[PDB]
Amino acid sequence: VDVLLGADDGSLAFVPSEFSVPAGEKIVFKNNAGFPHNVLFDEDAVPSGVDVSKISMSEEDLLNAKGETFEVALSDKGEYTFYCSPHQGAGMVGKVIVN
Ligand SMILES: [Cu+2]
């Protein structure tokens, strides 16, 4: 499934902000507008047994150009919160439900 980083109108949103995916489907975060963005998972809001380090960009690593991607596949079922490091305080956070 593709998730845009930044709305076309410059909003600091993942698009979609919430969605479900079957376990193991590739999620393609696609840099879109209103850079820089990156994608990390919140160690306090993922299913028990998930290691966010394996599924998160390094916080120091930013996507500054349209069409860069960050790709991840989530095998454990449950709710995960992801966020953009530079924009976390501006509400650029999302939820994926893996089913
Ligand atoms: Cu961002």
Curated annotation (Swiss-Prot):
Shown residues in whole-protein numbering: 70 to 168 of 168
GO annotations of cellular component type: chloroplast thylakoid lumen; chloroplast thylakoid membrane
Cofactors named for this entry: Cu(2+)
Membrane topology: Peripheral membrane protein
Known function: Participates in electron transfer between P700 and the cytochrome b6-f complex in photosystem I.
Compartmental location: Plastid, Chloroplast thylakoid membrane
Cell membrane as UniProt keyword: no
Keywords from the named record: Chloroplast, Copper, Electron transport, Membrane, Metal-binding, Plastid, Thylakoid, Transit peptide, Transport
Gene name, Swiss-Prot/TrEMBL: PETE
Cofactor note: The crystal structure with reduced Cu(1+) has also been determined.
Name the UniProt record assigns to this protein: Plastocyanin B, chloroplastic
GO molecular function: copper ion binding; electron transporter, transferring electrons from cytochrome b6/f complex of photosystem II activity
Organism expressing this protein natively: Populus nigra (Lombardy poplar)
Positions that bind Cu cation: 37, 84, 87, 92
Main location: plastid
Location of the Plastocyanin-like domain: 1-99
Family, as annotated: Belongs to the plastocyanin family.
Source domain of life: Eukaryota
